[PDB]
Structure formats: structure tokens, C-alpha cells
Amino acid sequence: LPQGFSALEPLVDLPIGINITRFQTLLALHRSGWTAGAAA
Amino acid sequence: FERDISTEIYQAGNKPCNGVAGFNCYFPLRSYSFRPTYGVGHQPYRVVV
């Protein structure tokens, strides 16, 4: 992680109003099986 | 500002309800008694917030 300061402006205030207690990120794969590039 | 749409049976004891009512298991959903021949308590009211 680089060391520095970066402002984070608000983008979208979505009024969902539901219960959330877990999450899971998504990933996109490339087909040549499957090969994925370097990411973090 | 949260809507609950879960149909799971409420469990009070240690016996699993297995999706149906029974011992220490009751249906959370109850129906209204809206009738025109009754009093204010059974009179439906359209509430907008």
C-alpha cells in the first residue's frame, strides 16, 4: 500500500434499508482452464 | 426503515421447527380482521409515511 493522502468524495447515497451482516467480493476470470492476472 | 420478508418459523424452545409450527413453534405472520360492521379497532386505516 503506498503512503499518501487521498480525499474520498461521496458518490452515491442509496437508501436500501435492509439487514446486512455478511459480504463477499466478486472476481472476473479470463479463458484461454482459466488464467487470472496479478491483482490485490 | 427496514422491511422483513422472512417466512421462517419462530423458535422458542430447543426443538427445531423444521419449517412448520408445533411445540414451541408459532407462525410469525397473522392476518388482519378488517370488517365494515365492526368498530375502530377492526377498521383499516391507510397510513402513508
From Swiss-Prot, chain A:
Outcome after substituting residue 19 to Q: Increased resistance to neutralizing antibodies
Source organism, top-level taxon: Viruses
Entry-listed glycosylation sites: 19
Protein task: Attaches the virion to the cell membrane by interacting with host receptor, initiating the infection. The major receptor is host ACE2. When S2/S2' has been cleaved, binding to the receptor triggers direct fusion at the cell membrane. When S2/S2' has not been cleaved, binding to the receptor results in internalization of the virus by endocytosis using host TFRC and GRM2 and leading to fusion of the virion membrane with the host endosomal membrane. Alternatively, may use NRP1/NRP2 and integrin as entry receptors.
Assembly and oligomerization: Binds to host ACE2. RBD also interacts with the N-linked glycan on 'Asn-90' of ACE2. Cleavage of S generates a polybasic C-terminal sequence on S1 that binds to host Neuropilin-1 (NRP1) and Neuropilin-2 (NRP2) receptors. Interacts with host integrin alpha-5/beta-1 (ITGA5:ITGB1) and with ACE2 in complex with integrin alpha-5/beta-1 (ITGA5:ITGB1). May interact via cytoplasmic c-terminus with M protein. May interact (via N-terminus) with host bilirubin and biliverdin, thereby preventing antibody binding to the SARS-CoV-2 spike NTD via an allosteric mechanism.
Record-given protein name: Spike protein S1
Range covered out of full length: 216 to 264 of 1273
